[PDB]
Structure 1
Amino acid sequence: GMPTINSIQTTVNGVVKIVKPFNNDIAGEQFDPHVLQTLTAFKQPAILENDLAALRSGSLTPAIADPVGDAVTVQSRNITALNRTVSVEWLTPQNVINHTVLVYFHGGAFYGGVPGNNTVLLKLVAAKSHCEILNVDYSLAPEAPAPAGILDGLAIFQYLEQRDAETMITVAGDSAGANVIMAATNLNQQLGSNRINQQLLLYPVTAPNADHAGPLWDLAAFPIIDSQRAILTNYHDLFRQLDSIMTDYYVPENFDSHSPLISPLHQENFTMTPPTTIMVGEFDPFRPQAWAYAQRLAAADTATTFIQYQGLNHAFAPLVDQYWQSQDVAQVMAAALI
């Protein structure tokens, strides 16, 4: 049972902006109470240690309650293209429609995470939209740093395009997975493929290791009530630390994080970029760079929708058994596919 929320839709700089409050009494500037109860640790500041294994040990989401069950089949398979073998968690709903497929890259700061972290979210989407979904186990840094994950995405696309000449691909992902999928999409387009007709981006990293004293990383953009301000500061500060650490893992010495294929925000042209829906929390430290990305698309005359979830932080979407806003994301995506 989901709430009846009065969202606010405006158009800012060509971007369709949809702001969804966490309830009908509070319009912004505080955490959703469900979220807040998870942030207790952020009463104190955190020092991110910077070792691979410790970082990875926090990137495993325990099984999310699964209401879909047998109505969607989840199986592993390997696909091969461009001399790359990439493992995918393949989701198949009942009564599959053709010529629409969703490719999804999980988050995990380029070095971690597992596709299982968002299986249940994707089962919701496949069940509603009757579309098959590729939940991809893409290459991870630093063992397989950039552009390994990108090339995996390219192989997946080639595979899909050669399998069927009529199937339309929607690319999606959360956080750093979205970043990688966006680059792969760019690369796919620069080779002449037009089969990717849509991006669904959940709080994407669009500018890894951006200036932490610049406007993309400025706490002044996150007004919040006094009692939650220390928590917000420490929370934002943790991600500031992560942003540096993760980009170091992702980018090898020969490459640079400010390049277009590492930072989609810095692409020189956005005219080939497909129609895009971005979903992100009010208090996600990556929110500003997501918004900057959206503005860039709209200015290039690409249809762009930016849904902001008030009171929400980073990485919330797969937690469909915790937040109505997660179920909402599931709905938005499904709707985008049918």
Structure 2
Amino acid sequence: VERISLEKAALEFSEANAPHPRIYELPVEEGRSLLNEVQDSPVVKEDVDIEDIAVDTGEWGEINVRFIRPLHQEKKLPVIFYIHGAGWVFGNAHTHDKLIRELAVRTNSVVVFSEYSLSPEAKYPTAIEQNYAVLQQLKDFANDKKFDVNHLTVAGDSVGGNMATVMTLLTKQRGGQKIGQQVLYYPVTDANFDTDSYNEFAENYALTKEGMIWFWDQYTTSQEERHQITASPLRATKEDLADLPAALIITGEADVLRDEGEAYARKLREADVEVTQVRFQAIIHDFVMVNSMNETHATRAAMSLSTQWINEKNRK
């Protein structure tokens, strides 16, 4: 029961995820249902136009891609390619609904939300190849979905932050659709479970060290995989990271992933990438996604900073 200072909704969400069996101790089908039920909880939602489109990723099959648009926009908007978190095992358009609607409206952008194949049914690198392939097709939707592919932000939370920063790496390496900038909400950057934040916040803050070990076990078959920079971008060299797009990296104080996210920000800064890195106090993992944490000072400030930072980038 001894916690560091937390906002009330973060304490409450930490207590509601203390009991066993925990999400990661359930059969995956019950895990997915449980998070859908958490994200059934009441929240003020921005009103938007939604279209679901089947996209062909070539070798990695067909996935649903959801297009979010703010109401009554007559001009071509900037585009955010958004990659959802929840461990590679959970998540869909419903679990991240409030968050992508707020992004869409406050940045006056089209949000392209890829429903990539979840682990463990699909293994690394399916999801990152599926995401990179719908990125290379944004140009073919731009006209019909009234967005400008030249004003392209990639964004993600947790494992989506992981895969969003990895889209910039694949994009530089293979010469894909130019990404202007990247927004990473408490990303996964490394398969190391022994950072200072990983030990301090191991238990009692909803997401656990054991939770993260299990997610990664669902994600990879092996370990010569977790060393690859498209799995663990924290392992990239200064040369790998050179010329990558401008980054906004948001961490929570009470988060096992805090230190690897802050570590990654430093590597990008040391490779001369423009980096804005900001740690919100008294907040846990998943704080911009979870409906019940929507009115936290951390969620309000992180949403204001991220939308202002994206708006500034798009003004150009």
- Place the TM-score, normalised by the shorter chain, in its bin: 0.7 to 0.9
- Unaligned runs of 5+ residues in structure 2 are 143-147, 312-316
Partner of 2:211: 242
Tell me how far apart the structure 1 counterparts of residues 202 and 211 of structure 2 sit (CA, whole Å).
14
Tell me how far apart the structure 2 counterparts of residues 82 and 43 of structure 1 sit (CA, whole Å).
42
**Secondary structure in structure 1 of the residue aligned to 2:221:** coil
Report the CA distance shift for 1:55/1:327 in structure 2 as closer, same or farther (over 3 A).
same
Residue 264 of structure 1 pairs with residue 245 of structure 2: no
Residue 252 of structure 1 pairs with residue 221 of structure 2: yes
Amino acid at match of 2:246: P
Contact residue 206 and residue 285 of structure 2 kept, 8 A? no
Partner of 1:183: 166
Tell me how far apart the structure 1 counterparts of residues 20 and 28 of structure 2 sit (CA, whole Å).
21
Partner of 2:267: 296
Deviation at residue 44 of structure 1 after TM alignment: 7.2
- Farther-moved stretch of structure 1 (298-307 vs 59-68): 59-68
Contact residue 204 and residue 286 of structure 1 kept, 8 A? yes
Partner of 1:218: 199
Residue 76 of structure 1 pairs with residue 76 of structure 2: no
Tell me how far apart the structure 1 counterparts of residues 91 and 236 of structure 2 sit (CA, whole Å).
26
Contact residue 280 and residue 287 of structure 1 kept, 8 A? yes
**Runs of 4+ residues deviating >4 angstroms:** 41-48, 162-166
- Farther-moved stretch of structure 1 (290-299 vs 164-173): 164-173
Report the CA distance shift for 1:80/1:45 in structure 2 as closer, same or farther (over 3 A).
closer
Report the CA distance shift for 1:45/1:311 in structure 2 as closer, same or farther (over 3 A).
farther
Contact residue 55 and residue 65 of structure 2 kept, 8 A? yes
**Secondary structure in structure 1 of the residue aligned to 2:103:** helix
**Secondary structure in structure 2 of the residue aligned to 1:59:** helix
Partner of 1:226: none
Deviations 1:257-287 (A, max 9, x none): 1221110111122113211111121101100
Report the CA distance shift for 1:265/1:96 in structure 2 as closer, same or farther (over 3 A).
farther
The equivalences for 1:1-338 within 5 A come to 30-41=5-16, 49=25, 51-60=27-36, 61-69=39-47, 72-83=48-59, 84-93=61-70, 94-95=72-73, 97-98=75-76, 100-163=78-141, 167-193=150-176, 195-208=178-191, 210=192, 212-215=193-196, 217-219=198-200, 234-235=203-204, 239-253=208-222, 255-268=224-237, 269-318=240-289, 319=291, 321-338=294-311
Tell me how far apart the structure 1 counterparts of residues 304 and 189 of structure 2 sit (CA, whole Å).
24
Amino acid at match of 1:334: T
Tell me how far apart the structure 1 counterparts of residues 43 and 197 of structure 2 sit (CA, whole Å).
35
Contact residue 100 and residue 337 of structure 1 kept, 8 A? no
Deviation at residue 144 of structure 1 after TM alignment: 1.2
- Farther-moved stretch of structure 1 (197-206 vs 186-195): 186-195
Report the CA distance shift for 1:96/1:267 in structure 2 as closer, same or farther (over 3 A).
farther
Contact residue 79 and residue 149 of structure 2 kept, 8 A? no
Contact residue 140 and residue 148 of structure 1 kept, 8 A? no
Indicate the percent of aligned positions where both proteins have the same amino acid.
23
Deviations 1:86-119 (A, max 9, x none): 2112101132653621011111101112221121
Deviations 1:236-277 (A, max 9, x none): 696210121111110123852122111011112211321111
Amino acid at match of 1:111: V
Tell me how far apart the structure 1 counterparts of residues 9 and 252 of structure 2 sit (CA, whole Å).
13
Tell me how far apart the structure 2 counterparts of residues 330 and 175 of structure 1 sit (CA, whole Å).
15
Tell me how far apart the structure 2 counterparts of residues 296 and 170 of structure 1 sit (CA, whole Å).
20
Tell me how far apart the structure 2 counterparts of residues 198 and 49 of structure 1 sit (CA, whole Å).
36
Deviation at residue 162 of structure 1 after TM alignment: 4.9
Contact residue 205 and residue 286 of structure 1 kept, 8 A? yes
Tell me how far apart the structure 2 counterparts of residues 149 and 233 of structure 1 sit (CA, whole Å).
27
Tell me how far apart the structure 2 counterparts of residues 142 and 244 of structure 1 sit (CA, whole Å).
13
Report the CA distance shift for 1:152/1:331 in structure 2 as closer, same or farther (over 3 A).
same
Deviation at residue 124 of structure 1 after TM alignment: 1.7
Tell me how far apart the structure 2 counterparts of residues 308 and 280 of structure 1 sit (CA, whole Å).
5
* Structure of higher RCO (CA pairs closer than 8 Å, 6+ residues apart): 1
Amino acid at match of 2:65: V
**Secondary structure in structure 2 of the residue aligned to 1:123:** helix
Max Rg structure:
1
